[model samples]
Every structure is written in C-alpha cells, then in structure tokens.
Target: VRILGYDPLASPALLQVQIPATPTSLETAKRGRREAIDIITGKDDRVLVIVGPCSIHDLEAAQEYALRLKKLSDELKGDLSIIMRAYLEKPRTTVGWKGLINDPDVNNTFNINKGLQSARQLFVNLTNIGLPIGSEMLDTISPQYLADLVSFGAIGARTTESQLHRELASGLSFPVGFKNGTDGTLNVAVDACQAAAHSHHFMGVTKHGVAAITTTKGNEHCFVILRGGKKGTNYDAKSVAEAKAQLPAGSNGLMIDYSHGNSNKDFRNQPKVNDVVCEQIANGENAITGVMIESNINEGNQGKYGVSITDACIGWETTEDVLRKLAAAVRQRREVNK
Candidate 1:
C-alpha cells in the first residue's frame, strides 16, 4: 500500500468502491457543458449567470438555496442561463478550511470518504432538479470523486499559474474558467486557457482508484473570469476592454465576477457592480459573456461551520434581487441590439 512511500488511503479497504455517476447525471452534465460553452461563445442569446454561495458549509442551506434559485431560473430562462455554484472545495489565500471534501467536519477531521459520498449525492440531486451545477477545482485529486457530477469548473487566480491545475483543466470534460491573478494580471489566465486547450499526458488515478498514467485529449471549452485584483477593480469597462484586447484572437468572451476585489470584497457592492457590468453589456461589449455572483441564504458570510468553510458571501435575498436586475439588464441590452 506504499504509493511513492506514502499509503494511498492509509487504511484497510472497508468501504465499498465509489459508484460511477449515473447515466442521467452524465447526460445532464453534457447538456450543461454545451449550453455553458455556447453562452460563453456568444452562440446563445441567454446571458450566463453563475450564482451561489461563497462556500457550501451546510447541506440544508445549500439545497434550500438551490431550490429557490431553480424557481427564479425558470422565470428568467428567456434572458439568462443560471448555473448554481456548489463550491465544495475552497482555495485559501494561505491556509484554512480547504472545503467539505477535505474536512467534512470543519474541525480538522478529514472524513474524505464521507465527504465524497455527500458531494456526489448532492450533485446528482441538484442535477435531477434540472439545475446545472458549477464548482471550483481546488484539490487535484478531489475531481476523481466529484468531477463527473460537475457541469462547469474553474481554476482560481491563485492556481491559474500551476501547471498541474492547467493539466487538470485540459482533461476536464466540462468547460473551465481560469481567473485572473489576485494582482490583476490577465496574461496568466489567458495562458492557462491556451495551455488547457492542448493534450497532455500525466499521472492520475483510474475510475477504480488505481494509480496510473493518464492521457487527455484536451478540453477546448476554456475562458477567463475577471475577479478584479489588488490594484483596483477590473470589472470596469476600460479594464474589461483592455483585458479583452490583451487576449489572443479567437478566444471566447470573459466572465466577470461581481464579488472579490471587483466589488472591494463588499457584499453590498455586488448589486452596483452588476449594474455597471450591465451598462457595458448594453453598450455592446460582446467580449463579456457572463457574470459570477457570490451569494447565499444570508447577506454576509459567517465564520466556517460544519464541513463548509470559505469566504463570506452576500445573502440569498440580495442574490435573487441581483439576478432579477441582471436579467432585466440583459433584456434591455437585447432590445438595444435588436
């Protein structure tokens, strides 16, 4: 049981082998992947709106929020494509709660086995409800247990420069978004996308949890997400335009995050930021494809509890209002374009 001198699981095999995702789940993921790509490429008229909690610490809260979002999504289907952010793995600035999968108890007890089970089950349940799911790929190995259930994936600013993450993105079946660095440089994200578009051979575990060298044909559906930076907010028209200009030709449009440094990390600023983004879209900013909002059942984030721990998020009520406004803005833009 020595994997390069360290045991893989470090325990006897007691639990049953993890089950592969259901055929229905796979199908939903496939459809979601296509739609997300289409939206980012401007082939779909509906504006992409990725709204969810900053981190999913409580399963009950997460499900309740998803249910609420589903109703709103149905109402705004004409103007927006809604993707629920079920972020289970959180990327830390230094070190903190990794996510549900790494520590299901949030008390440093890494019950990864239970965490994986919960994640897969939740994914299936969410997709069954006709809602597409999205997540950030923080841990390289966590995907083996949960990626099959994800419709869309993202590489945060911190990991965008990591070769392993780029390789992981290359192999992902669904579309991936790479965020600009915390310092606000777009080149790294652009490079990550370009790199992820090519095939690569790397070491990975098989479906049966066996260690093996795996080769990927590369994922073509990759784009950039502007989450602002330390210098200042990058969600502005001039910043976005400049970022777009910096990208190579034939690249897909960018996804702007209303949270993070873009809004000065203020939950209340999310709505105003969205309004600014809407104005840009109305003025014919074709390079802007979608928006990402960090929202939950409450307005601001509380300290980590249970298995979920991450950044603070704007609450659910504010989330719904923002979604409504964004849909309206898109509608107005459509009329202007027409």
Candidate 2:
C-alpha cells in the first residue's frame, strides 16, 4: 500500500526558545488569568466579555486591537472581565484557509513554524500589556505551545463531541468553553463538558517533542457556549435555561456568542444582539455570566489582508460602544443589587 507518512513537527521546546513568554507575561498569566476564570465562572461579581477579531489574520492589526481592549479592560475592571479573543486557529465547515498557525500567510503555503512563532510573539506581547488572552483550542497539540499563555480556551462546535478534544481540555491549565453543535444542539457541548470533567487517557506529545501516552486528571471549569444554531438563535432565556439544566455543574454562569446564527452572521447585527445581552444583565440575568462578540479595528470583512480573512466583524467603534454600554449595565446591576 502506497501511503503518506507523518509530517515533521518543530519541537514545542524549540519553538518556545525562538519565541518565549517574557517574565512579565508569565506573571500576568498566572495572576491575571486566574482572575479572568473566577470572573467568568462565578467568584468575581463582574461579567466576562470575550471580544476581538473573528480569527486574527494580521499580527499588527491584532496587536493594535489587544492594546485598545486592554486599556478599556482596565477602565472597566471594576465591573467587567474582558479577555482579548486572539484566535489563531480557524475551523472550516468544508475546506478553506485554516488559520494563522497553519498558514501565517493568507495564501496558505502552510509554513507552520512561521505561524507558530508569529502567533506566540503576539500572545507574549499581549500578556505583557496586562491583558488576558483567550483562544479557541483547535488542533489537539497546538495547545502545548501556547496554552500556558491563554487565560480562557474554547472547544469549537465541530469538535465538542470528540474524545480527543475532551481529553485535551482536561489537561489544560485554564477554563475551556465547549460550544453547542453547529446545528445548535446544546446537549453535545453539555456532554463534552461532563466528559472533560473525568479522567481520560490518550496519545499526546511532550514538551520536548516526544510522543507518549498521556493521562489527564480532567478539567472542571468547562462551561457551555450557546452560539445559536442553523435553525435560529438560542441566546434566549428559555434556551439558556434549557442548556444549563443539562450541565452537571450548576449553570449560574454561561457565555452566549452574539455572532453566527444568533445574529445570522450579519456583522452589523452583532451590536444589536449584544445590546440584548446587556439589557438582560441589567435586568439581573446573572445566569448569563458572559458573551462573545467578533470585533476588529475595521468594520466588516476584507479578505485582501490585515482584516478578518475568516468571518466578518464589527469595527472598533462598535466594539467600544457595546463595551461602554455593557459596563454601564453591570454597574447598574451592582447599584440595584445594593
């Protein structure tokens, strides 16, 4: 049988040397990331808002967005836990440009090393700026290189039910959010969260780039992400309540994605939908602990370069507007609860 063999991968150890997290980045990761998890899960009274580009295609653009978000995060630190969505991996429905880590160039020449180095440097820089970074954990092994720098992680809809992803989440140092099925079935993600909470043994790579059988203690902080569905939006109160009922861990806090089916993928409608989430929070809807919005420096999609080569996103102006409004809503919650 004629067969293709395994592709050579750069050692996670070697890559880390080429581009490593600075001391300041490491410190903030341990200190600031924990606070982000607590805020999203339940410990902190603030609401978690994970917002940024849909999939970071340009390093310069992403770095700019992170700095802006960090400044805003500091300003709203009293009421909001903002995590920059510095996503480097993009999962395609059929076949398309994977992400920066797979193709640093938008043309998809598949230069993994460049992609890893580029993304790692960006992550290190963002953490150095005192901003907690969040990413969708796509490929199973990708996490070994950068997971330590991530404050929050997500399992996309396509892989939520995979045993591989569940095991990967189990070993992660940060909280992971499992999204409902692409069709919007919350049970798929609910089941994933439960599976991740229990021990699992799987094949994994070592830091030195060695392959070995890995046993995971299982992750406990996984939450559900309701990204709506092909049928319709599921961010409604009834849908959220229904999804929470399936969670083994009580669901006092869940994250709702405002894009995709929720807003019908209309980037313009993102803020409109986010406004609804803000209104819900203002009305004391604590069950929704957070929300996800795709926002970039420039509004809409531009496939040429430095813009969302993946999904369309609202501009920075819209993103800031929503943040201000949401922060105000949370402040109102505190005032009324007092």
Candidate 3:
C-alpha cells in the first residue's frame, strides 16, 4: 500500500450533483454543436471558432473572460459558432504543472481531487454564463465528469498516435478534433479521424466508478487539427490543402489551431496566422471549417500562474479585434457568394 498511495476518488455521478450543468445549459450545449457541425459540413456559412485561454488556471479570470466572450459570441452569431477553449489538463512532454485538472493551484501540490471539483464547478458556472465550452481530453477519467459540459473535445498532438485516444474519441459524447503530430505529420491525425468515425471497443470506467468494456458507436464530427510541428508551419494555403488532402471524401471540415507549432510556438503569431485563415475562409474554402484561438484577459502569458499556467496567449482586446474582422470577412464572403 505504501508503494502506491491511494485515495477514494469521487464518482462522476456524485460530482455532477455537486456541480451540475443547468437544464438550459444542457440544451445549449446540445444545440450549439449542431450549429458547429453545420458550419463544418458547409451547411452554414459561419465558421466554428474555439477561442479562450491556452489553459485555464484561474477560474475567476476564466469567468470574466467567458462573460466578455458570451457577449461577443452573440454579436458574431451570424458568422461564427463560438466555443471557449477551457483546456483542463496539460499533457506533459517530460514535466510541468500538468494543467488545472492535475494541479489547479498552479503549484506542485498535485491535488487532483480539488482540481476535478474546481474544474467541474467552473464548467457549470461558465455554461450558466451562456458560453459553450471546448477542452482538450487528456485524462480519460476526467472527461467522465466534465465531458457532458463540453461542446467539443480535442485529442492533443502528443496523443494523436495513441490507439487509446482513437478509441476514446470514438465514444465521446461530443464532436472531437485530433491534432497532427509534433513532427508536423498529418497521416496519424487523418488515420485517427477515419478510425474514430467507426465503432470501437475499449476498457474504461463508467460514471458510477465501475471498470467495464466500452463499446463505441463512432464519431462522425471528428476532424484533423493542423498545429504545425518541428518540420515547419503547415497552416499556410499549401499546407492546408496538403493536410485536408489526407482526409476521406466527406470530411465534415478541418480546424487549424492558432497556437502551438503552427505559430512557431509564439502567441504573437496568432493574429497574423488567424488573418491567413480568415483570408482563406473569405475565399470560399469550405473545407477550412473552423479555427482555434488562444486568448485571455491579459495581453500575454506568465511563466508560472494566473491567466495561463502553460502556454501564453494574446490579450482579450486583440481577440476581440480579430473576431470583428472575422465577422466582417465572413459577411463579405457570403455576399460575394450570393
């Protein structure tokens, strides 16, 4: 017992009652995704936008950000289906805080129980604020508690090659995005998408905390997220086409991440990179269905805690400006098509 310390983890069912999504939010989450899917499938001219802090460490700051974004989401509803990127877990390459769901305090204490509770609370609060939520699905167990609250799920680059992740995506309740490898390769992501579109069987826990064999009905909303990588930026027009080329005949659509390797690992690159995508979207690139933006109330990131515990992000002001331009571009693009 000493070799492996253990503590009783609260079941997802218990946590839901402790911190639950409101009836209205529950409906909003379901309705929101259909709109997002419509955008991805070209049934809608508006783009699906997932914008928020790189990784939320402060629920207070996240609340404030969500409030501002909720207003913006309504303002640009005609041209965008906005979801807040409130990633809970930070996958470790070798080391780090491991994200809010692991160490929410941004300290090294690693109190995961508290992390889970706070994360769920924040989700409920934000949903109550009328903002749809998006988050990376790092810990499969954690999602059991919060996935019901999320409008979209992401299979991060680090795990795109993992068979477990592919299986996990197959059964997820919401639409999912699988990012390309850190080496800038798209084959794995593409394969993952195709695989997830079919049924699967894997071992996982149920909401009541029982281990069982899980069968998946597959997910059709899954697509590839081009975050670029060591090779170089794969978000350019040439790279975008190459990435999309790897997909099957009917791809719903693709999402290009505004941060990470795509921007060469700098928050400063988001604005310019986002402009490039907006330009393409304006050009009637229906395959380019959506984009992800890393933004927070503050202008940039800190090395330790606060707005973001891991990656830095642009200020809210910049986020607002870019979104405004996106709305304008989308409106103009639709006019031309008319």
Candidate 4:
C-alpha cells in the first residue's frame, strides 16, 4: 500500500508548554467538570446547555460568541449550566472540510501541526475567559493536545460504538456523552455507557508523544445523547423514556441534540425540536438532564463569518431565544416538581 511520507508533529507536552494552560483556565476547566458531574449525579438540579457553532473556523467569531455566551451564562446561571460547543474537529459522513483541527486553512492542504497549535490556542483562549467549552472526540490522539482545556466531551454517533472510542471515553477526565447509533438505536449508546464505566488498558500516546500502554480507572460520568437518526426524531418524551430505561441503572439522565436527526437535518427546525424537549422538562420529565444545539453567530452555513462551515446551525438571536426558552422550561419544571 502506498503511503504519504511522514512529517514531524509537535508533542502534546511540548504544545502545552508553547501554549500553556493558565492556573485560572485550569480552574475553570476543573470547576466545569465538577459542576457537570454534580448535575449528572443529582447533586445539582440545573439543566446543562451545550450551545455554539457546529465547528470553529474563525477565531474572532468564536471569541465573540464565547464572550456573549459568558454574559448570558451568568444571567441564567441559576437555571442553566451553559457550555460553549467549541468543536474544532468535524466528523464527516463521507468527506469534506474535516474541521479546523484537520484543515485550519480549509484549502485542501492538511497542515496539521499548524492546525493543532491553532486549536489548542483557541481552547486556551476560551477557557481563560472563564467560559466552559465542549467538543466531540472524533479522534484519539487530538484529545491529548486539547482535552485538558475541555469541560465536556461527546462521542459522535458514528464512533459511539467503536471499541477505541469507548476506551477513549473510559480514560477521559471529564464527563462524556455518547450519541445513539446513526440508525437511532439506543442500545448501542446504552452499552457504550456500560463499557466506559469499567477500567481498560489500551495503546495510546503519552504527553511527550511517545506511544505506550495507557490504563484508565474508567470514567463513571459517561451518559447518553439522543440525536435522533434515519429512524426519525427521538427528542420526544417516549423516545427519551425508552432510551433512559435501557441506560444503566443509577445513570442520572440523558442529553438530546436539537440538531442532526432530531431536527431531521434542517437547521431551522432546531428550535422546534428544542420546544419539544422544553415541554418535556416542564412536564416533569426529569430524565432529560441536558440538551445540545448547533448554533453560531449567524444562522445556517454559507461560508460566511460566524456561520457554520460544517452543519447548518441556528444563529445567535435564535440561540439566545432557545436558551431563554429552556431556562423558563427549567423554572417551570422546578415549579411542577415542587
């Protein structure tokens, strides 16, 4: 088999030095993780809201989004635990612009070293501002470079069932959410949660970028994400209950993605899907612990500033509307439960 020539890449440890995480930034990450665990374990009752661009292509736009989100996060702190969707990697169904981390330039030249540096720098910048962020773990190695800066993580539907990704989840330091299978099956994701709750040893790179055997005590914070699928929308209460039942006992709750199959791949429908989930919350469906939305500074993907370069996303205005709506729902849910 013909292979491309290998080139030198910066080690994770070296990159950390080049763009070190500040004490403040590390605290932000640690607190974000702890708070998320609290919410998942029933120690905290606030709803988790992961909202932002589908993928990060422009640094300024992301920062702008983060700042705005920070303000809004504070405003709704009592009702919602907000985390920006600072995704640098994109998992393609076939192939296109892989993501900022894979093709920072988006011009077909895969300058991964530069991409990794840019990605790590962006994460550092965001967390430094005291804004917690979440990203999809599309690959095993990249997490070494940036996971420390992340508060939350997701295993996209395509890889949720992969042995490697399951192991990856087991080792990650933060709470990880697994999306249901592409066909909308909940069993695989339920199984993934169980698999990730146990210890595992696997091949991986060290901080110095050397290959070695990695062992994990296992990540008990793993949960499920319902993104719907070809089978149809699963954001409804019935699906949520079905998925929750199949999940491991003691699992606190599940997350529903407003984009992807839940919205039937239409960006405009995210709010519609969101409304359904909010209603469930108001109706005392406490099994819904969190929600994910694809949102950017602008609505829809059109190769413009702040718009998604991957999946189409709800714009800023709609995002704020969605968050406020969710906050209200949580308030109502609290009242109903009381």
Candidate 5:
C-alpha cells in the first residue's frame, strides 16, 4: 500500500476551549448572524457587503485589515451590514496551497494542527474586535472548529453542486450563502438553498471527535450569491431579475459578486461592476439584497502584505471608495421608497 497512516488531531472542542470567545466576541457573532438573517428576510433595510482579502495567508495583514474595516463598518452601519472575510480555506480547481488551515507553513509541510490553531485564533481576534467574519466553507470538517466564531458562511461555486456541502449548510450555525455554479448557472445554487432548508441526516463527527449520524433541523437562513460564470457576468439588473425569478417569492434577494466573470477576471474591473450595482440599488432594486467583493490592503496581488495570495483583489483605497458608494446607493434607495 502506498498510503501513509493518519495522525492524531486535536478535537474541535479542545481547541474551542483553548481559544475561547469572550462576551463581546460571542455577542459579535450572535448579533452578526441576527442582523444577516434580518437583512436576508427583508426585515432590515440595509445592504450586506462582504469584503476582505480573498484568502488570509498573513496574520498581521489580516488583523490590520480588520481594524480598518471595523471603523468603516461603523461609519456605514446605518446603510450596510459589513462582514469581513476571514477565509482560511481555498478550494483549488486543481493543485495549489489549499488554505491557511491546511498548510499554515505555506510550504509542503502541511502542519494542519498549527494551521487550525492559527485560524481559530484569527477568528477569535477579529470577532473580539467587533467584526463579524465571512468565510467560504470548503472543508466541511474545518467548520466544526471555527463555525461558532463565524457569523456568515458560503458554499463556494465549485462545491455548490455537492450534496455534502448542501448538507453541511443545512446545519450551519449562521446564515449561509450558496454561490452559483462556476459555469454561471443559478439553478444549482437555487436548488442548494431549497435542499439546505430541509432537515437531513448525514455522516459527521461531533465536536468531541466522535463519528455519528448528524441530524440537523435544517437551516432556513440560506441564500444565493451570483458570481459571474464562464459564459459571462450576472451583475446587471436583467440577470439579477432572471435569477431572482427562480427563487420562491419573498425569499432573500440575490447577492451579486463584482469579481470573477462579472469583472472578466480582472481586479481593476471591480469598480466598473460596483458602479453598475450601486446604480441598481439607487434605482430601488429590492430583488438585490447584497454584494461580495474581493479586496485586500493593496490594489493587486504580488504575494506581499495587505495583498491577496490567491485571486487578485481591489486595493484598500478602492475598497473604501466602493463601499461608500454602496452605502450611498442604499440611502438613495431609502429616499426613493419614501
């Protein structure tokens, strides 16, 4: 056999205790979830803006980004429900560094225990600073250790069609968004939402590390994120309306991503895309509930501090500029409705 035996790992419960949540941090998570659910359910009249580095490889850069984001979040709190991305896992299309939690060393060492520890600590530190974290759940098992600290979660487009991910979202602790298929089809994500809203029994391990039949009551706080597909973008009003038409009436509106196909895979095009989305909001497009942006401390990627190590992202300056525009659009919509 060419197989190497598995090694012992720390239980999620053990890790949770080691890096515990304080009252402030716990409340940040709870409040973030409640606000997100409210926004999705149409009870809140604010836009959800998920923004941050594409993947967190540098702890200092991420923490600094969070501090800056938290201040901006407060400034735009009235119009936008801001959540900072604390993504630790990156689902590669083929072969690459998986994420911070899979190989914290960034080399081929694969120190998963250390990576997990770093990820948990990072989540705790961010939450403690009063910034709700937004992460993509690529590895189902990782959530067990970090879910309690996450306020918003997403099923990546690649895994949107997987039943395992659908089941994972079904029992998540907070609101989750399902990205449309990589090819840009909305049906799979829509179907995923429907499936996640129903209870399921699946094979999963408890927080204590015991294998068992994990039964879930089903998570109703599930929505769809429209990331542009291979064919083209979906950030336009017509595309948004078409996607919204597929969901049940009164469901949480779609969240449009300004990166990827929408920007033709060019980070510089995010502002162009954001301008269009903001225009829609200003025109009072209620079918659109939120937006996802890939942003870092720098404008582009060179694998340095405050820059993305994965997908190229808009820099911090652009990030703030676009966020302000987004907030302004929401305010304009409020006036239009009045």
Candidate 6:
C-alpha cells in the first residue's frame, strides 16, 4: 500500500517506534492536571498556568525556555501548577505554514516524516526534564504519536466544532480544553465539552499504523478555554461568567487564554490580560480553572508564512515576570480565602 509515496509498514527507513505509556509519568501528569483542574473548579487551592510559545519552531529555544520555567515552577509550586505549552501544530485562518511538526522546513517542503520524528524527540526530551507538557490537538493521528508525552490537550477555536476533533477529545487520556470559535462564541466550546464527556466510536490508526475503528470510554476530563474572538476579547469578567454559565451542570471548569483573542492578538497586551485574570482570581473567581499564555524567548510574533517562519511570541523576560505576578496574585487570593 502506497501512502504519499511511502509505505509506512514496508518502508525500510520507517522509524517504527512504539513509546509505551509511562505509568509513572502518566500518573504524575494526571495528578498535576487533576490538581490544576480541581483548583480551577474550586476543589483545590493551586492556580493553573499553561505558558509557552505560540508555536515551537526551535527545540533548543523551547528547552531553554522550559529550564527557566521549571525554576519558576519550583518557586510557585505552592500557588500554581505550571504546564508548558509545547504545541507542534498550528491551525491557520486560511493558508499558511501548519506548524513545526507539519512542515519542519521553513519552506513549503512538507517533510512530514521528519517533522513527526522531530516532534516526538522534542517531547521526549522535554518530558525528561520533569515538566508536564500541553499541546493543541489539531490532527487526530498526531496525538497517537505523542499523546503519551502530553499532560493536557486542547482543541483550537477553529477546530472546536469539528466532529473529528470532538471525537478525538472524547478518547483523549488527559484533560482536554475546548476553545471558543475565532468569532468568540462560547457555545461551541461548551457544547464540545459536553459532547466529549460521552463515549463515541471513530476511525483511528493503531500503533502499527493499522486503520481501525476505535471506541472510547468517554473522557470526563474536559473543559473550556475562553480565547476571546475576532469580534473582541472574551477574557473579561462578563465573558468568564458567561462561559461558566454555558457549561453543563457540574463541568470541569474553564481556562482563559491570555493570547489569541484574549490578548486582542497583541503580544504587548498579554501581561495586561494576565493582570485582569489575576485580579479576578484574587477576588475568588472559582469558575476559572487556569490561564494560557503564548510566550517564547522573544517578546513579539514574527510573520511565519510570507516573511517569518514562526509566529512572534512574548520574550522569556516578560513571560517570567508575568508568571511571577500571576503566582503572587494567586497567593493573594489564597490569603484572602484564609
């Protein structure tokens, strides 16, 4: 069988690697993810903060960023649960480079084979550093390659309403977050959360690259991410309230993305947005499970398609400051509760 001119099973060069599910690692990730969710849902005390670059184009830079974040995580462990956003896929509005894993080369050369290997290798390395990772689940099959390494998963705004994505979320082992549409409607994400909570059967690839129908036991670990929209930002109090209300009775909770629509797509505005969220949390906003920030070693996005190969991201210094401030805010919130 020829697939894209390469037979995955028959190719002598195919890197047929099967990464066994690390029971210990998975348990740790689950505990961390659950604790974070519990805090967001008011069942725990720690605040959840998912911070990293918008897209990881350079593994070295990402690792360096992770090392810095790991130190902060240790300092803020009492107040916050930190998860690195090591996203390998990027969904475009129309046409552009998909992501690091889809097109390893900055050019149009879609060497997916290399891309997948690179993605897996990076995740393995990052996980080895004892930091939990989060990724946006864009391609369904892509998860099969690296889901074991991921602590949390997300369905992007553009793909939140996709049935394929919803089904994918239902089967995910880790907690999944569904973001509002690009237009900023919470209903899509809310509905997705509800739907993913139920079992479903779908087509999927097995470990050996075999096409098979997959049945899921249903994932109860699902939540919503308020990313605002093209219309306007939705990370405000009203938006959070509306999103909470939209969820089914007794849902996991919601996570706010400081980037995307929440930041008005401005890197400079991310810290401001973080401040608003911190204020809300400090005031005891239990509906929010956590927040996501797009940050890197640099403080702005560069053009990725026509000019730059990767999106601009907030630099490491700003990210560190924001993380520290948010941690302090959570401490304040806890103090107020006490």
Residue-pair clashes, model 4: 0
Q: List all candidate RMSDs to the true structure.
A: 3.1, 1.7, 1.6, 0.9, 1.0, 3.4
**Per-residue C-alpha lDDT of model 1 across residues 151-256, encoded as one tens digit per residue:** 8998998999999999999999888999999898788999999999999999876656677888898888899999988777889988997997888877988999
Q: Report the backbone clash tally of model 5.
A: 1
Off by over 4 Å in 1: 1-24, 304-309
Residue by residue across 1-338, what tens digits does model 6's lDDT show?
56558524322123334333355545656665666666656777777888888887788877888888888889888888999988899898788988887788858888887788778777776766777889999998887777767888989999999999999999988888898998988888888988898899988887666679999988788888888886789888987887777777878767888888877646788889988998998888767768898887666666522112355567778888898898888778777777
Which ranges of candidate 4 are over 4 A from the true structure? Answer: none
Instruction: Give residue 89's lDDT in candidate 2 (0 to 100).
Output: 90
Residue lDDT tens for model 4, 172-199? 9999999999999888888898999999
lDDT of each: 0.81, 0.83, 0.86, 0.90, 0.90, 0.79
Which runs of model 3 end up more than 4 angstroms from their true locations? Answer: 1-3, 304-306
Q: In model 3, which range of ten residues has the least summed lDDT? A: 301-310
Clashing pairs in 5: 298-315
Q: What are the clashing pairs of model 4?
A: none
- C-alpha TM-scores of all predictions: 0.92, 0.95, 0.96, 0.98, 0.98, 0.91
lDDT digits (tens) for residues 1-338 of candidate 2:
68655667788888888887988888877865677578666787788888998998777778888888888888888888888899989889899888889998868578888888888998998888888889999898888889778888989989998989999999888888888888888888888888898888989998988889998998878888889887578887678667667766454368899887788868898888878777777877777878888988887886454468678988888888888898988887777667
Candidate 5's residue-wise lDDT over 222-316, tens digit each?
Answer: 89999989867999988988887798864677798888667796999999999999999999898788799999998787645677888999988
